[PDB]
Design a protein around this ligand. Structure first.
Ligand SMILES: Nc1ncnc2c1ncn2[C@@H]1O[C@H](CO)[C@@H](O)[C@H]1O
Ligand SMILES: Nc1ncnc2c1ncn2[C@@H]1O[C@H](CO)[C@@H](O)[C@H]1O
Ligand SMILES: [K+]
Lengths: 260, 260
């Protein structure tokens, strides 16, 4: 069917999914954007309803795969959207439960441990970097929301295929301990250059969120603390840039590059 | 003195510096943030007026160094600021006159050439990365505004110390030919991995602005085209992340690292 009024109860229900509490209550979440919807589908998430705006393309209908297709008016679409200018393709997906239970890591795994709550902008950028480098696992803080409109948007949907899990620090520590993997703490005060670390057999990088920084306890127990060199006026890099540099250095060594 | 009303004439004039048009007309620009003001001062920029918010520190007054010190109400500060949460220290500086003609590079220069008009946010982030890697020079497009609040904030004020020059394509080409810089074009389809380039003897990286492509004339000219591996879903990284990866790879090789 097609819904005209932004006051229609279905539209109100869809708009309510902007809130985390409503996503948890309903077990549903909204994915906005043609690209983001394709990414969620590819990742194996279950589509319940496809939403199409007035400027949707005929190809967008093929994304439904049997799900309900709901057409929205311009005004109805604007109510449901979290964007300045709404995407013309959106999907209502089942909110999956994520858990490290039984998760196994491949050989010489590249792991990023992001300590502390992170802002959605940074978080999206970090996930994109992890996606690019082919990280085997990303651990984030226990309360991190990976299904918010902002994280989905800022990661361009990279969040969906990535092995990323919100976990308490205690659980994370115990999980990492089970593997023969070095803990490498990133910090501008690190004693070694990050190029000097040996990541050829895998690595779990420890990286603090932007405003929290690396917790002293994690810095202490790391096998090595590494810095990215700063050669100008700035005392530190953005957290996502830091994450990319670390992951791509591990990738360089996996690709045959020698530690410095 | 202390100014209370956001409608005070001084406040309106200060708030008017939010437009490039008014900055050019007055030869003045606003630098917001204690850190950014200090770094502007370090760079030798001339401070005309120090602005102090109600919650400024007594230690902030020392920044004035002979300049007029104007105190603002929370109300008045909010109108001058470009932030939701205004910094309590701001500075009105004189616009400097900068020319590429008076620039000489080191023995094995690290140069970034950013082609096309770039969003102010991305630009500041690129400059922060360039400063960290210790780039000798960054060339940007002719119309690029380096004194916008966004470039200042996202560079954490590193824009002030970093050698950055807005130049037309002809002037950039002239500079590069004259300094005999090897041109390496960064593109996702590059024939070589960016680790496979030899940057030990200096390099100018050619990088297209976000969403903008890399001009075929520049791409063709380059000695080599290199890509950053993308092992996940996405096909490209954010421009500031790309810039950081390229520049720090060059720095790795300068620091004793060999090409892949
Ligand atoms: N040059 C650097 N070396 C190592 N870690 C860094 C560097 N710059 C920023 N970080 C890290 O990035 C995050 C953002 O401040 C923090 O966890 C911080 O420790
Ligand atoms: N994987 C990559 N390799 C080389 N350049 C890239 C890569 N990803 C993005 N870029 C560049 O970064 C900018 C942002 O799209 C463009 O100049 C683009 O060419
Ligand atoms: K529920």
């Amino acid at each position: 069917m097609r819904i005209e009024s932004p006051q229609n109860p279905r539209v109100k229900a869809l708009a309510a999914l902007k809130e985390r509490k409503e996503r948890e209550r309903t077990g549903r979440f909204l994915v906005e954007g043609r690209r983001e919807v394709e990414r969620a589908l590819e990742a194996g998430l279950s589509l319940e309803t496809l939403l199409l705006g007035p400027k949707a393309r005929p190809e967008d209908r093929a994304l439904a795969g049997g799900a309900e297709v709901l057409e929205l008016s311009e005004r109805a679409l604007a109510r449901v959207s979290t964007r300045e200018n709404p995407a013309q393709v959106l999907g209502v997906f089942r909110l999956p439960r994520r858990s490290l239970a039984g998760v196994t890591l491949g050989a010489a795994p590249l792991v990023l441990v992001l300590l502390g709550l992170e802002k959605p902008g940074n978080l999206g950028a970090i996930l994109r970097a992890a996606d690019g480098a082919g990280a085997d696992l990303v651990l984030v803080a226990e309360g991190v929301d990976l299904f918010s409109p902002q994280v989905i948007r800022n990661s361009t949907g990279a969040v969906f295929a990535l092995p990323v899990y919100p976990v308490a620090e205690g659980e994370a520590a115990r999980f990492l301990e089970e593997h023969n993997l070095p803990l490498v703490a990133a910090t501008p005060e690190g004693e070694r250059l990050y190029w000097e670390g040996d990541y050829r057999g895998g690595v779990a990088f420890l990286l603090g969120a932007e405003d929290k920084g690396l917790p002293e306890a994690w810095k202490r127990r790391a096998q090595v603390r590494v810095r990215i060199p700063m050669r100008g006026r700035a005392d530190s890099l953005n957290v996502a840039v830091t994450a990319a540099l670390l992951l791509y250095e591990a990738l360089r060594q996996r690709s045959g590059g020698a530690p410095l």
